[PDB]
Every structure is written in C-alpha cells, then in structure tokens.
Amino acid sequence: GMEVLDLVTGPDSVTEIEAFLNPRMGQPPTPESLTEGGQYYGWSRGINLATSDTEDSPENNTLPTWSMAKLQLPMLNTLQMWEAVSVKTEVVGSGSLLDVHGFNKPTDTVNTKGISTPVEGSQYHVFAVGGEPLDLQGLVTDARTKYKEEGVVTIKTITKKDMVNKDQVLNPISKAKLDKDGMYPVEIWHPDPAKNENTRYFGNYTGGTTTPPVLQFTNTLTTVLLDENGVGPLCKGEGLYLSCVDIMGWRVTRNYDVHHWRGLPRYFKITLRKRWVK
Amino acid sequence: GMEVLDLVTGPDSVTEIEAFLNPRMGQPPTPESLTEGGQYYGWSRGINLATSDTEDSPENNTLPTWSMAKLQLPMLNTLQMWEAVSVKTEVVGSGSLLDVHGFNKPTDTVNTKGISTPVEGSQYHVFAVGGEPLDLQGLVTDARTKYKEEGVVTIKTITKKDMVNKDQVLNPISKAKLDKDGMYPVEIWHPDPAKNENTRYFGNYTGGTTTPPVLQFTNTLTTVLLDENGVGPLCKGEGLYLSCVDIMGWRVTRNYDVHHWRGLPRYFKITLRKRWVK
Amino acid sequence: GMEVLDLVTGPDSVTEIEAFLNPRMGQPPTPESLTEGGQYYGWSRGINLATSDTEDSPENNTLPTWSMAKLQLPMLNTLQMWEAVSVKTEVVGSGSLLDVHGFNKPTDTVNTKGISTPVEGSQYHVFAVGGEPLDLQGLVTDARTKYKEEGVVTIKTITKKDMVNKDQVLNPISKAKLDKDGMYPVEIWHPDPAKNENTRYFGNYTGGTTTPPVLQFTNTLTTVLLDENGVGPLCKGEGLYLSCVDIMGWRVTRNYDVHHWRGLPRYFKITLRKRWVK
Amino acid sequence: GMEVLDLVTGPDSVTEIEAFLNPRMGQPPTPESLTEGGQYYGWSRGINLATSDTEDSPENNTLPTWSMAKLQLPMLNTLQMWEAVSVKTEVVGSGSLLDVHGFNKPTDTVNTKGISTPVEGSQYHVFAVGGEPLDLQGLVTDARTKYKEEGVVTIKTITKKDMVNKDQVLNPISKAKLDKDGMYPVEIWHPDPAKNENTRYFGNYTGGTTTPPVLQFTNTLTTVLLDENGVGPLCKGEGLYLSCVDIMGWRVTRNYDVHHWRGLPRYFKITLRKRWVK
Amino acid sequence: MEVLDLVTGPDSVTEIEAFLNPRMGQPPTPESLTEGGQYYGWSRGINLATSDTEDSPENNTLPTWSMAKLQLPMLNEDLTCDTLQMWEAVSVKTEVVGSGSLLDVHGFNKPTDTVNTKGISTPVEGSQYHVFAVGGEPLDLQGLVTDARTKYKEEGVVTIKTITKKDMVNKDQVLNPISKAKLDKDGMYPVEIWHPDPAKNENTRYFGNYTGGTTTPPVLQFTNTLTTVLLDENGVGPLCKGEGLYLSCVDIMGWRVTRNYDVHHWRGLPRYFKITLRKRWVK
Numbered sequence A, B, C, D: 001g002m003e004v005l006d007l008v009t010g011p012d013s014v015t016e017i018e019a020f021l022n023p024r025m026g027q028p029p030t031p032e033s034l035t036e037g038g039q040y041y042g043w044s045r046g047i048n049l050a051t052s053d054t055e056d057s058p059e060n061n062t063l064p065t066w067s068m069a070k071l072q073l074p075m076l077n078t079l080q081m082w083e084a085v086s087v088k089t090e091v092v093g094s095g096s097l098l099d100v101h102g103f104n105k106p107t108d109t110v111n112t113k114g115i116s117t118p119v120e121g122s123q124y125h126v127f128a129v130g131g132e133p134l135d136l137q138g139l140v141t142d143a144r145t146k147y148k149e150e151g152v153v154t155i156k157t158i159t160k161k162d163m164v165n166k167d168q169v170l171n172p173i174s175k176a177k178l179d180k181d182g183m184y185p186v187e188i189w190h191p192d193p194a195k196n197e198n199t200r201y202f203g204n205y206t207g208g209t210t211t212p213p214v215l216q217f218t219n220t221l222t223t224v225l226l227d228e229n230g231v232g233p234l235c236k237g238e239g240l241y242l243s244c245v246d247i248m249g250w251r252v253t254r255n256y257d258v259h260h261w262r263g264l265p266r267y268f269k270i271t272l273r274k275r276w277v278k
Numbered sequence E: 001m002e003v004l005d006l007v008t009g010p011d012s013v014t015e016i017e018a019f020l021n022p023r024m025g026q027p028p029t030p031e032s033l034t035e036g037g038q039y040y041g042w043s044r045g046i047n048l049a050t051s052d053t054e055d056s057p058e059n060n061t062l063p064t065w066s067m068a069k070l071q072l073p074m075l076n077e078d079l080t081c082d083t084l085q086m087w088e089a090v091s092v093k094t095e096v097v098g099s100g101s102l103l104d105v106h107g108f109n110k111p112t113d114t115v116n117t118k119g120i121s122t123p124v125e126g127s128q129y130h131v132f133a134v135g136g137e138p139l140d141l142q143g144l145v146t147d148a149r150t151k152y153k154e155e156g157v158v159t160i161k162t163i164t165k166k167d168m169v170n171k172d173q174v175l176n177p178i179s180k181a182k183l184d185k186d187g188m189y190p191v192e193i194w195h196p197d198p199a200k201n202e203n204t205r206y207f208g209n210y211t212g213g214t215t216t217p218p219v220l221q222f223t224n225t226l227t228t229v230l231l232d233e234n235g236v237g238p239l240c241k242g243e244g245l246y247l248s249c250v251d252i253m254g255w256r257v258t259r260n261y262d263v264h265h266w267r268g269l270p271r272y273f274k275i276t277l278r279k280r281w282v283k
Ligand SMILES: CC(=O)N[C@H]1[C@H](O[C@@H]2[C@H](O)[C@@H](O)[C@H](O)O[C@@H]2CO)O[C@H](CO)[C@H](O)[C@@H]1O[C@@H]1O[C@H](CO)[C@H](O)[C@H](O[C@]2(C(=O)O)C[C@H](O)[C@@H](NC(C)=O)[C@H]([C@H](O)[C@H](O)CO)O2)[C@H]1O
Pocket: A044, A045, A046, A047, A048, A059, A060, A061, A062, A253, A255, A258, B053
C-alpha cells in the first residue's frame, strides 16, 4: 500500500477510462417533464434572498453542489495498484450561451427589446482526480446562514452542532469528504489543502455580477497527475474518484430580476497504469 | 489502416493545401443584391426574441452555424495515407471593425451623435482539422426552443423526437457529424470530446453584451496537429475536413436595438505527409 | 553561521511543516458570539470615513492587518541550520463568495430584488517565508491620518513622533519588523526591498471599487525559495516566519453603502532541509 | 533567387538599418500651421457619420490608412541577396496620452468638471517587414459604403467596379499591394494570408468605445523574421518594405461627442545579412 | 569600444542600491502638512484648458521623470593605457513600493455613495504608467506631445521649446527627430512630453508600460525574487561611462478624486533598484 515500486509491464498494464459529470446547479435530473421543473435542469431554481440580517435560509435547489463519480477499475492481484498518470478534461457546451433569443431580461428595458441577456457574472471551475474521495474543508460567508437540515450536507451535518464564528475563516474541525454527488454545496465546501495527498485538484474563481464568462476547450491538452516524485494518485480498492463544478454565471428573468445559476458538464479521460507496491 | 508505420519518402511525399472558409452567420451568400438581403452577407439577420417562457422560435437566418469544407487530396493507393502534420490558420478582417462611421446605434444616444457603435459582445472562435467529419455533441440553453424543422440540422433532426431535459446538460444520445456547411447551429452543436480521435479542435468563448472584441493575426504561427504519439490526423479516403466558426459579436441598429451577429472568414494552410499504414 | 556549506544527510535531515494563517481584517477572533461581534470575524467592521480634509480617524477594527506566525523547528545543536527549500501555499475559501443569497445591497435596489451583491473591489495578496521577521517599510496615503495610538503598530509607534510628509513616499526612517499577528496595518506597512535578505515575499495588488475578485487554487503548485545561489531562507534560532494578507474586496450593506473588508485564510506547507554552516 | 544557399561572410556582409514611420490617421503632414489644420496632425479629422442605411460617405481625412516605407539597401551584384534576420520595433509616445489637461469631453459632464477624458476605445496594432510590398486582402463592414474615388485606394480602385456583397466576407478578387504610404484604409485592407511568402506580419485588434488603451515599450525585445527553414525575407532588387498602423483609440470633443482617431509613430531597426542564392 | 574578458579577483563584482521617489508635481518642500507638504507623492489639482486654443497646465500638475546618477569606484589610474576597465551593469532587482497604501479607502475623497455622502473614499483609479531604465549614460529622450499648442511654462519644466529655443511644430505631435533631449535632471522632464528614444539608448536598457482610461483598476506586482537581466544580445550590459550609473523611472498609479468639482490628483509611488555590476576589460 505505502511503498511505491516499479511500473508493471505486459498485457493490459495500462488502461484508459472516460466519463462525463453533469452539473449539479440545484434542480435535480427528475422530474423530466419540461413543464414540471425539468426545464430548469442544468440550472438552479430562482435564487431566494435573506429577509433580514438574521434570517438567511437558502433553498437547497438554489445551491450549486459538487459533482462526483466513483469509477470501478479492472480487478488486480508484492501487490499492484492502479495509478492515475494523466487526464484530458473539457467543459462542454459554452456555445449554448450564444442563445440570446430567449425570454431573459432584455438589453433594452425601455422598449423591452434588443437581445435576451446572456449568462454573466460569477464563475467557478474546479476539477479533481484522486484514488479516494476529495477531502473538503468548510468555510462560509455567514456562520448564521440557516441551511436546510434535510437533503444537503453542511457543516452542522458533520459536527452535529451549529456553526461558530471560526467557520467564516479556517476552522479545522469543519471537514468532510466528497462522497456523494449533488449534496455538498460549493459555497460551503472547499478542497482541503491540508489533506488530499492522493488527489490532484485545480480550481479558479472569478466574481462580479455582470462579468463576461470565459472558457477554452480543446482535445489536445493533457493534465499530468504525477507528483514531484513521479507518482500519480493510487486507487484504493480499485476506485477512481472524479470531482468537479463548473459554474458559468447566472441568467436573469424578466420578473423581478430572478437569477438562475448555469452550470456545464465536464468530460474526463483518465490514463492509468499498474504500479507495484509493498 | 489502424497500425501506423514509417513516414513515406521520395518525390511528392509532402503536400501543402490552402482554403478559406467564409462565415455562416445567418444570411446566405445569395441573393447577391445589396438591396434584396445581400447587404447582410457576413452577418445574421435581426435577432428575433421569444414571446413568452414557452414560445421561443428563432428564425434560421438569425442563428450562426458551423462552417465546413471537405478537401480532396492527391490520389494514393501496406497502404499509404495522408497525415495532417500542422496548420497555419488566421481569422481575416478584424480591421474592418474600425468602421465606426456607419448607421449603427450611436455612442451618444441623447443627441444621436458621436460614432457608430462598433461590433461588441459575445465572441466564439473554434477551428478543427481532421481526417473525417468533426464529431458533434448537442447541448442547448433550452430544450423547449422550437427550432425550424427545415433549413437547419438540430437535435430533433437526428433523434426524430422532441428534445428532452437532459439536452440542457450532456445527453449522449444527442450526437451528430459536421457533414454540411452552414447547417449546424453553434448554439446547439459542440465538439464531442468523447469522439474526434482523428481530429484536432481548438475553441474559446467570451460572453457578455458590450465586451470588447479581441483578435490577433500573424503569418508566423504554426499549430502542430501531431498527437502524443507523434501521429497527425489520418485522412480517410484522401479527404481532409476543415471546420470553424468565428463570431466577433453584434452590431446594434438605431431601430429598437436590433442585433446582428458578425462573423469573419478563416484561412487554413495545412501541411500533410504520406504515412505507411497497415 | 554566515558561511553556507554542504547539505546535511542522514535520518531526519529533511522536514515538512504546515500551518494555516487566518485573515486579520479588523474584527478579532473574540468575542465568538454571533450577535455581539463574532458575526464579523473574517471581515472588518463597517469602514468609517474622514469628516474633513484634516480629520481622518479610522477605527482599528476597520483596518486590515498582516497575519503572521513564528513556527518552532526541531532542535539542531561547524553548526547546522534549517533551510527553507520550497513552499506550497493556497488561499482557501473563494467558493464561499458564491453566496449571493444574503442581505447585502441587492442588484435591483429599486424593488429590493435580484441577488445579494457578492464581494467586489480592491484585492491584495501577499505571502512571505523567512528565517526572521519580515522587514517592513512604512508608506501611507496621508501623513495626517490620525491612527489610534493603542491597538495598532503604526509609524508613530516606531518613531515616537508624528508622521512627516516624506512618509507619503519612501522615508527610510519609517521601518519596522513584522513581529506580531493582527497589529500592523497593510495600508501602512509594506515589504522592505532594501532588507529581507533572509525572506522571500510575493505580492500583488488590484484596485477599484467594483472589480471582480479573481483567485486560483491547486495542490500541485510549488514555490521555490532558493535564491540565485541555491540557498533558501536560513532559520535563525530554529524559527520559521510566515506572513500574509489576503483581501478579496468588500461586501456592501443595505444601509448607507457600508463596506466591510473580506479576507480569506492561507495554507502553507514548507519543506526544509538541514544545512551545514560556519 | 529561388534556391537559398549559404550565408555570405566577410567585410560588410551584415548591416543594420533604422526608420520611423509616422501614423497616417487622416490629417496629412501639411499644412503645418496650427490654425489651418496642422493641429490635427497625428489625428484624424472629426469622424462623419452615415445619414441613413443607404448613405455612408466617409471623408478621406477621417479614415486611418497604412503607413509604409521602402528602404534602399547597399548594392550587391550565384548571386547575393539581402536577408532580413530580425527586427527591433517599438511604438513611441504612449506617455503623451497622460495629457488629461486639455479641452476634451470632461469626465464630469453634469457640471463640466474633472479632467479632460484621455484617448480610449478601439485599438489596432500591425507591423510587417518584407522583401516586397505587403500583400493586401480587401474586406469591409459594408459593401454599400461610398468611399471617395480620389485620394484613397479602395476595392473599386482595383476592380474598376462597385463592391459586391462578397466583399463583406473573403472575396479573392479584392486584392492589392501596399505600395503607397497614407493611401490604403485599414478598415478595408488586411494582410493577405494566402500570399506574403516573403513578408512577416504581426497584428492585433481590441475593440470597444471606452476600452483603456494598453501599450508596452522596450529596447530589449527582438522579433525573429526567419521562417521554419531558417530563412528571412529576401529583398528583391535590394528593397526592404516596412508597413504598420498603430491606432490608440479616439479623443472626444465637447461638441456633439465628435471623435478623432489617435495614432502613434513606430520605430524599426532591422538586421540584415547577405545570402548566396541561385 | 571593444569589449573583452570579465575582470576577476577581489572586489571585481559589486551591488548597489537606491530608491527614487516619485515626482508627481508637488516638490519635497515645503515639508509642512498645512502648507503644501500634504500633497508630496501627488500632483496638485489638475487644471484644465479654458478653450481649444488656451491650454496652460501648471508645473505642479505635471508628473516628471525621476532620475539619479550614482558614482561608482574609479577603475583606471591612467586613461592612456591600451586596455582599461569599466563597470558593467549585469542585472537589476527593481520594485515599486507601497501599493498597499492604496487600500486606504477611509479618507475624504469623492465618496462612492453620492446620494448620502457615504460608502467608501474612492480609491486611486485610472491611467497608469510604469517605466524604468538602467544605463551607463543619461536616458536619451524623444519628444512627442498630444498638442503642439499646449502652453507649457518656460520656467520650471524642461520642454521641447527649452531645447529648440522655438515654439513646438505640428510634427511634435508625431515623431520629430529634432525634438530630443537627455534625462539629466530629476523632477524636470514631463512624462507627457518626453519618451525613451528608441533610435539611441545603445548603452541603456528601458522597460515601459501604459494602461489608460479614467476608472481603470490599478494593478501592481512586487517581489524580492525577480531579477531583470541587463545583458544585450551579445552578453554585454550597460558600460558606465566615467563610472557613472544612471537610474530613471516613473510610476503613476492613477488619480484620486476630491469632493470639490471632481478635482484629480496624480498618485506616484517610489521605486527601488538593486543593481549588480562587474568589472569588464575594454579597449
Ligand atoms: C410555486 C411557489 O410559490 N413555490 C414556493 C413554495 O410555495 C409553497 C407551495 O409549493 C405552493 O404551492 C403554495 O402556494 O405555497 C406554499 C408556501 O408558500 O414555498 C417555498 C418555500 O418553502 C418557496 O417559496 C417556493 O417558491 C419557489 O422557490 C424556488 C426556490 O426554492 C424558486 O425561487 C421559485 O422561483 C421560480 C422557480 O425557479 O421555479 C423562478 C422562475 O424564474 C419562475 N419561472 C417563470 C417562468 O416565471 C418560477 C415560476 O414562477 C413558478 O415555478 C411557477 O409556479 O419560479 C419559487 O417559485
């Protein structure tokens, strides 16, 4: 398990696996009906605001959460372990944001004309590949936020106690593991840099309200997953963990400026090799 | 030929081919008359907006589509195939956007003075070179969008069924191939990262409504098309596929802020070599 | 030891230490109460403005200060010294800025709708690793600013005299050392480039009032601390000094646009090796 | 001089030539008088707008044109040719844009106060070095634009016929050579990527109306002119061609927001070597 | 001058440091914080033209180049010797200090809430200009102005007219090779007039950048880990003529805006230089 030896050679010593992770912006995949809520799939529901400085209770379907998948690798067996060497990853569908013919708040609000305002604002892109769940560190805007006690994993879920003022900075007690898809809000749970020895993660954030969204995509870019010692994530029990979130901004409706988060799916193609371990 | 062998040497073992792909923003090349619609060539027609949350019917000539060309390579036939090594590509005509003396919405709307507002807003630049058609993955803003059944290839064209809520995220069923110029809307069809083993594509997106357009151009830049194994796209049946879209933003008229998409043509110069295959 | 010799080899000759430094934006860690002030931890209190050109008296809890920590390394004693080779550092919690459901100034102020305006504006990111306290150089916007005498270390604290007009530019008399956490205002005290021979510091500033905050984070980036001669900071008396400030911008309230600074915590993982010295 | 052989060695086998090209924004160098039009030298005259969708008649002195110069090299004549190896090029005078004390549209228009608004907006920087005139490809915003017949070289000058709708995209008929300084409008004529085998060009465009101008300048940067085969432009008949345009944006007056283009001069220092040719 | 081998031995390499304070318009004196000294590090309030033909900026509203000449140790007892030694500038660590001070948003500038006169004191924003140079002789300057009609003061600033003894011509709005000078005095050459001359400066390295606009966010990086190489393409750094080393800079961060008629004041910051020099044999 611990001591890393030579690369295994011979038939089937290398494998490639691919997966797509759909975004988890708030509306679940079901109901599928385009008149019963399914029309919001790929988006959050309308963001609901605090009613006072002491009453902030966001609905679960307004909170983007981490996407995750655990993939099973070919059975193995000094022992052998699968080692993640590299990944090609791509966020797909930015071209869909060129739809400016819909019924969003129009650019000319005097005549109700122009174009349907495209998705704009705060953007958040993180992906990770590891041999165990992504380790998470909690940190919130407001320790007083009344997150729901059902259907979501928050700091109180883990500690069994209300949040404290330290949860607005780094409180080492407030940790979790990304072990469920669509359950851990991204405004609460961050990659833990004090752990994640067996995972590589890459994140970026751009804020603002009207910020132009930016994205690049190509099938020619490889992300190396080997550490400073030439060792990739080692997959415990032949399980490979993929984690991501890809927020593009908000669309804004014609009714009291209601905002809906927009997310996009992420492709992963991971190259793995067998590694001798002791 | 699946197995890639040595490079072919001797007379005419290397070739160089060039092409330009004109943009397909909505107005077709004909009619040519500058009073009958030809004056909009290089642009879309005026973007028409949804009339309700459930009534979004964009006209075909308001939707930018993929440009594509299939080029015939010198005849050949252990067999030989043409291998695309590199490409020099350039978007031509950004200097034309320095025309601020026209009849667009003026910069001083109070007095109808200043300059004619230049093209601004959302921008989209993708090119691809491959030995078969570019593989496409469908993904839309709104699965309820009522695209025309004739004159465009959309998800319904492929599936023979209405779009589903999954089409707003990644639905593996919604796939196509870029086999026709000016027919596949870019707000629907994206490069499929799960396929395109024999094509290289490079894309970028910048959104917003008044975003400054940015472009670089030079005859000194070479894009390598060789993969991680040193193998370029292999041209099946001696056909080379070029695909692109180059949206610079919109111009805005003096009449109810009507927007017209602006596109620019793309130059390709591809270097190819003969490769032994079996 | 001033003369640097060979690296020490053998058992325990290399060590790794980690720490997090919480931000010091103005509100202290106590009281912890989420009603009596603890709700502002990780933030400043409401920024108070000058009442005239000659009356600028900022409150201590409105002034972000440097974070610092002195870490004790393993006992060592031609002598040996600990040498800081490299650091992996990360600013944690940018995802928490995606909370736009609170009670900040809303994006639609006419109807009190839209979203809770996220953190925006001036940003400041500096970190340092050294074998002694970070050397500081004073420089202020206004030498007339009346800082509190107690509770902050300012130029007057050091000189025992009022600031002079030269303190608005570079005055070599106005120097200090970063020897206390949460005490040295970042609008006064800057890394001194004329000293810090035994410290590496890295800073950036982005100004403005509504500027989108930008942050990257990954566990794959290593910052080398070796100088041009291959020598890292040497830890005097086995003490390692970490210093930082990470301002993301301000939040704005619904009452007279009151601004509160937002800061985020910084993780450090330092690799050290024993060095022979004479 | 088709087959390129060895480099020539010996006395005077390498040479350096320098030149500055002044901008050609619309006002000619004469009259010199600062009351008769000379005050506009370095700028365009006030941009005049179309009066309808079918009446766009820009005046020649409102249209920036390409700068060019043909330089004579030392006499030479297996023959020898001058080969351009590299160029150091710089745009001079960006500091002059720090003049915000003039009579431009003020930053506070409510009270007519503040500062004189500095040059802002669309920017266009292109330079070329070659052994023959820069090859130009025509492309316009509007094929209906009524350019003057005398005083500018436009598409009609070349074809002897009105522009066609194809001229709004890539029309290979619409070609020219940059053989005159201050005559070819940059909104019409672009470097032709299908030609220019013996010229290197480098261009960039940034659009918008109030975009901050950006410029870097240093005497430490060398641009290599050698192609992929290590051969620079070969100077036919010992003539070296320099081409450029450097638009910084517009100034805006206090009278009906009249805009004037601003251009800056470009320095070139070219290193050339003698090459044996057959 | 033929450049030969590097000199070896005791004291063949040296490091020297200096800070250059900004020259935004208000001189260092008077020092009093009620008599004008409160503006040191800033310009005085920018005064505007009163017509298209009447543009008379005051000297204290015009940022000028900072410069310093440093004298290095004498190397040659006898200049008639066939082979001599010169100081060669190899590299420089340079840093603009004090961007953190722009985080003061608690002052009496134009406030961000103009309805209630609340919010924050608007931070420094707008046009930015960063140039530094290191050379073995003064920085060569090329004149180029926005307006050849600008009526600069004849005393207190070095302008094109100072040099030519004649009024500016329309050519001075583009490149006029007649309009040249050398940066031989601190706080005297306006940066809206005088630019590094790319046709000279063979013995100087300069690095400049400009970002315009009115409300543009200021951006700055600072670190003690970044070395700027001064060696040319042939491996030779600036050679110090008569052992003189020239440092030149300007670092404009933008303007602050007051509560009285949006009066703007330029803000500048000081720049640190640490130059590594070595002795070089020459003939
Ligand atoms: C429909 C509704 O009012 N829903 C409330 C919910 O109301 C419950 C109950 O469901 C309802 O039938 C009954 O009349 O009243 C009770 C109690 O009030 O109560 C919950 C609180 O637990 C919410 O307040 C909920 O409101 C919805 O909350 C969503 C976030 O959870 C979101 O903001 C909804 O807003 C949208 C939406 O996302 O669905 C925003 C969207 O832009 C709108 N679409 C269009 C085309 O206008 C829709 C739309 O108005 C409704 O979905 C149509 O019914 O709302 C918000 O309604």
